[PDB]
Every structure is written in structure tokens, then in C-alpha cells.
Enzyme design. Structure first.
Site, mmCIF file in Angstrom:
data_model
loop_
_atom_site.group_PDB
_atom_site.id
_atom_site.type_symbol
_atom_site.label_atom_id
_atom_site.label_comp_id
_atom_site.label_asym_id
_atom_site.label_seq_id
_atom_site.Cartn_x
_atom_site.Cartn_y
_atom_site.Cartn_z
ATOM 1 C CE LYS A 255 -4.892 -58.316 61.141
ATOM 2 N NZ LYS A 255 -4.657 -57.481 59.942
ATOM 3 C CG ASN A 256 -4.764 -65.228 61.774
ATOM 4 O OD1 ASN A 256 -5.461 -64.546 61.017
ATOM 5 N ND2 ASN A 256 -3.533 -65.649 61.475
ATOM 6 C CG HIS B 243 3.526 -56.710 61.079
ATOM 7 N ND1 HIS B 243 3.322 -55.818 60.044
ATOM 8 C CD2 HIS B 243 3.247 -57.938 60.577
ATOM 9 C CE1 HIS B 243 2.915 -56.476 58.970
ATOM 10 N NE2 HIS B 243 2.826 -57.777 59.283
ATOM 11 C CD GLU C 140 -1.626 -59.201 59.953
ATOM 12 O OE1 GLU C 140 -1.856 -57.991 59.841
ATOM 13 O OE2 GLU C 140 -2.346 -60.070 59.438
#
Ligand SMILES: O=C1c2ccccc2C(=O)c2c1cccc2-c1cnn(C2CCNCC2)c1
Ligand SMILES: O=C1c2ccccc2C(=O)c2c1cccc2-c1cnn(C2CCNCC2)c1
Lengths: 344, 346
Positions: A233-234, A226, A230
Site C-alpha cells: 500500500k505504501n 499482513h 501494508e
């Protein structure tokens, strides 16, 4: 229901250690013991989060989305209350309990976006983004962390008593680089689909005490996934959107370091970075620098930081405007340092 | 006379000055009479506000001989400037006496930092006390030492401009080449490192000028402030590197990146000195906490003072480590002179 909440909120949630999770999901795992523990601990944790929800201002609390989330918590507490008189020796009790925990987990699947919707319903009615944001920030951190803790207990029970060498959701030999690669592969699918280009991944491991040894720890792989998903993706969005005309993208570099106390994972991008003024904001609920699948509703970083804090870790961001960003996940290296962080 | 002067001047708030004001008032149009009539109001205001800050210390810290000595300096300095309130700016001897008085004040206060530190130790030697008063001391010392940086900046501007290297406006270099200051700090740290350890890591500098990739990175800044921060960070990086490689012929280099964005000029110093656990970072920024005789270790004031120098023109200084690998220290400065304004405690 206000009666049940008052009774159970007299008690404090009990922080559980990684050693306890492993011991209670081991060879000696007893379903009857798990049942008699969870039919006390889950109402305590549910009543304490329902008290936390009542610490919201009346105008946030009266939004349709917050009232819906509150109604779920009430329904879940009442479901567990049905088990207080039931006999642990009866195999039907244990089977019904597992089914009830699956129902509760499923009922709460969309809590995070629903609670986010209630915060937007508050703005659509009052028309204002003032200094009550600090109160909402404070409450949502406590609310979402408490929820991570409840889903952890439910996942342990349903995985143990309904890969294969895990103890429920815990991998005692969690290969950190493998989880990094998994998060990267899934981010890269989204990045390639939308941008038709993605940066490569480089991983370096520094095992200070054992130079040649692959880095392993006791951890919940889905929590680490998780956070890293995240952050990827950034890093991928920043990299592709700052190199929109380049054939050559700079790679994302991940370092995994194991010291005496800390297991640190640093993700370094060359996506152009962010001014220092904008960092604190990135950790605010619903603040977004951004349809691209790499952008969400501004919940990635603050939720990811809660997953890190949950077993006594942290997640920090440090940028250099005009170059790029370092994101560091800090975990406890030792299972004996890894204890639930529950809001107090 | 002194508690009266302090009450009168503490009614006023210190006036934050911008880089444009420092450059304008040390420029072609520099008028010494203007600097005098400004400073004979602003310096008493700043002295009275720091003397009030000192009186916000608990009575047991305030009564230490070292804190009473520091207080006596501030009192004498306020009284020195009071003698100029009636004096005529049109008399060039007033202006010359004023410069002489500011040099005397600057010299009198040279040892404030270690003397104030001694008062904190005198407090422990008498109470034993290392409990929950430390956050109050930390809070006060940040405000005290930053207020002092601001008073010394005003005095240095006046004495460098009006008493008499050469392209500077007092202590400000409008074309401060950041890489040159990095090299200066490194050379001086390296002399101390070589003298004690007989080895030192090399330096690598990379520049990223985002808007102008081939241009050397320049800014308007006070070189001595940047030098102070980088010298303290180099001492730490060199000590960590040599003490973690005590048997190695090969030391990993210290890497400095200088990045210029639209708003930030960022300087990252990266060492491979084995790093620090996250639990120990907050205490590196605590006054008198030391991981440590080696000249690369001080009395635990390097990082917290360095961070005040960064904060003074609206920057910051952060530390992030990876236990078992090494440490990154980042100085954040405002790239633009138009964003560069004193940060003063009131
Ligand atoms: O299924 C259980 C379990 C599952 C996964 C992780 C941990 C546990 C667990 O801890 C547990 C379980 C069942 C029965 C008793 C316990 C227990 C042991 N110590 N306590 C203490 C709480 C704080 N101090 C006072 C007692 C509670
Ligand atoms: O010598 C001077 C000087 C030297 C070095 C840096 C700055 C200054 C400086 O600014 C100054 C000086 C002399 C006379 C007046 C001023 C001045 C201008 N504006 N203000 C106040 C306006 C209202 N409140 C906020 C500031 C004071």
C-alpha cells in the site's frame, strides 16, 4: 478479577518454538493437552498484558476507549477462569473451551483501532503531543506484540481442533513468492479502484545454497501477508502520487533472498523517497505522510514490524530522497531459530 | 599548570561552526588575525573538552601506556597554544609562529587513531576483559574520535588558507562534484584490490538529480572526508565481492547511486558480495570487530570512523544486507550548506 490478575501475573509467559507448534498440531495432536496447556498459559498471557496496560499514565488509562479495551481483557480472563475446575476427559469441556476461545478472539477484533482512539482521546483532553510519546510508543509495542502472541495461540487451537495442509495457521512449506503475489494482488485492487493505475510487480529469488530451487520456509502466511500488504500500500501510493501525470509507472521490485540464517524480502519502489529525518517518525504510532484506501491511521509500519519481530525477525526502511525507498523484512530461514519474542 | 589550564578551558563549551562560517572566514575577506584570535580560544576549549572526555575512561584503560602517550600529546598541544594567549595579533611573526605551532600539533597527533586502538588491546592483554565495558568504550571512542575530526578540521582550515586545489576554501570544495570523489575512492581501492587479488569489480555510477534531471550533482563539502568514507566502503565491497567469487572469471560490478533531494544528498554503494546476516551488522560498527595479509582489511576501524565523518556535518552512514545476495551502504549528507553545521560532543 484483581485477585486472578495478581495470581497469574506472578508467572512469565512461556515463549514457544516453531518445532513445538508443528509437534502439537501434528499426527499426535491431542485436544486434551492443548486445553490443559492453554487454561494455564492464556491467563498468564492475559494477566501480563493487563499489567502492561496498568503501566500507562492514569490520564491515558481513564480514556473511554482504553477502559473499554481493559473491560474486554477482564471479561476474557474471567471466561477462561470458568475452565480451571472443568474435566479435560469430558468432550463437552473441550467443545465449550473452543467456543469460548472463538468468543474471546471476536470480542478483541477491534483492539488495535480502539486503543488508537484512546491515544486520540488523551490529546483531545490535554491538548499536547510532547515527550510522553516515547512512553506510549514503548507500551503500545509491548501491548500489540503480546496480543499477536495471544491470537496466535487461539488461532492454533481453533483451526486444529474445530489451504488444507497447514498446521493451524502455520504453512510448513510456505512459498514466500506466492504470499508476495497475494499481497500485491490485493493492494493492486485498492490502487486501481482509487487511482485507475498501479505499478507492475517484479520478483527476483536468490537461493544462495540451491540456485534453481523455489524459496520455502516454515511460517504463518497471514503474518507475512499482513506485513507485505501494508508495505505494498505504501509503495503503490508513493509511486502513483509521485507520477500523477505519467502514463508509465516504475514497477515495484521484490527480491527474496535465502541465506544460511536469514530469509530477506526487499521491496524497492521509485516513489520519490523520504528524507532520513522522517524515517524514525514512519515507525511512530499515528504518524501519517497523508479518501485514498492506500492510507490508514499510521499503524501499518509499526504493527508490521511487530509481526516481523514476533518470530525473531525485523523490518527496516531505507530511503533515498528524490529516488525511492527499500523496505526489508528479515525472517529466520530455519524453524530451529524461530521462537516467539514475548515482551519481558 | 596543565590540570589548571584543563579545568579553566573545560568551563567553556565547543562552538559548532556552520559551512557558511567556514566559507565566509576563508573568503575574499579572510583575515589571518581574526582566525588567530578565534583559534587561540576555540582550540584550547576543544582540547580541554577532549582531555576531559579521555578522563571519563575507566582507570584501567587510562593507565595503559598507549592511552597515557595520547594524553601526553593533548597536554603538550594545549601548552603549545597557551604560549600565544599574551602574544600580539598585530605582529605578523605571532601569526607565522601560530601556523608553525598548528602544523607541529597536527603532525604530533597523526597516529592518535591506531595508538588509542593499541590502548584498548593493552587493556585486554592485562584484564582479559571483553564483557559489558565495551559499550562504555564504544560510547567514549565515538565522542573522542569525532572531537578529534573537529579539531583537525579547524587546524586544516587555518593552515590551508593562511600558509603559502585552487578553487577550494581550505579543505572545503564549494562545488564538490560527488561522482568525481566516488571515482577517486574507487580508483585507489581498485589499485589495492588488483595488487592482492589480481582482479577487481568494475564501477557503475547512476545520478538522480530529482529537481534538475540533466544537471551534475554538486554540493558544498570537505572532499577528503567524503573520500575517506567512500574509500573504506569500496575496500569492504571489493573484498566481499572477490572473496565470494574466488573461482569466477566474471565479478559483479559495484553500483553507486548518487541521489539529490530537497534536504538529502544520498550515496548508496551496492555490492553482490554474498551479504551478512542481520545479527552481524551492529558488530560491523563496533571498534576492532573484523570479519577477516589482504590490504582490503584494516584493524576494524573503517566503518565506525567513516560513520563519524558522516555525522560530523549532520549526516549518517547506514549498512543493510541481504544474506546470500549482497550489501547496500548508504551515506546520507545534508544537500544544503545552510543545514551543514559541526556535530560536536560536549
Ligand atoms: O499445546 C501445547 C503447545 C501448543 C503449541 C505450541 C507449544 C505448545 C507447548 O509447548 C505445550 C503444549 C501443551 C502442553 C505442554 C507444552 C509445553 C512444552 N514445553 N513447555 C515448556 C514451557 C517453557 N519451559 C517449561 C515447559 C510447555
Ligand atoms: O575564524 C573564525 C572562523 C573560522 C572558520 C569557521 C568559523 C569561524 C567563526 O565563526 C569565527 C571566526 C573568528 C571570529 C569569530 C567567529 C565566530 C562567529 N560567531 N562565533 C560564535 C558566536 C556565538 N556562539 C557561536 C559561535 C564565533
Amino acid at each position: 478479577a484483581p485477585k486472578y490478575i495478581e495470581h497469574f501475573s506472578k508467572f512469565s509467559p512461556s515463549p514457544l518454538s516453531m518445532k513445538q507448534f508443528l509437534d502439537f498440531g501434528s499426527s499426535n495432536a491431542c485436544e486434551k493437552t492443548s486445553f490443559t496447556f492453554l487454561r494455564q498459559e492464556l491467563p498468564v498471557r492475559l494477566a501480563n498484558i493487563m499489567k502492561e496496560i496498568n503501566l500507562l499514565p492514569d490520564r491515558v488509562l481513564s480514556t473511554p476507549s482504553v477502559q473499554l479495551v481493559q473491560s474486554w481483557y477482564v471479561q476474557s480472563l474471567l471466561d477462561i477462569m470458568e475452565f480451571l475446575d472443568k474435566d479435560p476427559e469430558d468432550h463437552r469441556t473441550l467443545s465449550q473451551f473452543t467456543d469460548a476461545l472463538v468468543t474471546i478472539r471476536n470480542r478483541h477484533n477491534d483492539v488495535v483501532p480502539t486503543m488508537a482512539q484512546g491515544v486520540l482521546e488523551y490529546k483531545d483532553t490535554y491538548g499536547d503531543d510532547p515527550v510522553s510519546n516515547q512512553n506510549i510508543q514503548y507500551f503500545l509495542d509491548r501491548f500489540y506484540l503480546s496480543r499477536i502472541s495471544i491470537r496466535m495461540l487461539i488461532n492454533q487451537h481453533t483451526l486444529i481442533f474445530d489451504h488444507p495442509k497447514h498446521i493451524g495457521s502455520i504453512d510448513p512449506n510456505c512459498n514466500v513468492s506466492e504470499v508476495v503475489k497475494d499481497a500485491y494482488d490485493m493492494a493492486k485492487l485498492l490502487c486501481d479502484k482509487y487511482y485507475m493505475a498501479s505499478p507492475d510487480l517484479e520478483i527476483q529469488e536468490i537461493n544462495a545454497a540451491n540456485s534453481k530451487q523455489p524459496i520455502h520456509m516454515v511460517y504463518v502466511p497471514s503474518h507475512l501477508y499482513h506485513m507485505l500488504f501494508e508495505l505494498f500500500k505504501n509503495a503503490m501510493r508513493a509511486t502513483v502520487e509521485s507520477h500523477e501525470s505519467s502514463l508509465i509507472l516504475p514497477p515495484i521490485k521484490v527480491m527474496v533472498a535465502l541465506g544460511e540464517e536469514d530469509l530477506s524480502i526487499k521491496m524497492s519502489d521509485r516513489g520519490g523517497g523520504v528524507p532520513l529525518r522522517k524515517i524514525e517518525r514512519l515507525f511512530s504510532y499515528m504518524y501519517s505522510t497523508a479518501g485514498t484506501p492506500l492510507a490508514g491511521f499510521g499503524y501499518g509500519l509499526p504493527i508490521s514490524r511487530l509481526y516481523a519481530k514476533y518470530f525473531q525477525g525485523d523490518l527496516q526502511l531505507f530511503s533515498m530522497e528524490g529516488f525511492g525507498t527499500d523496505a526489508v523484512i528479515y525472517l529466520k530461514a530455519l524453524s530451529t531459530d524461530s521462537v516467539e519474542r514475548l515482551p519481558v
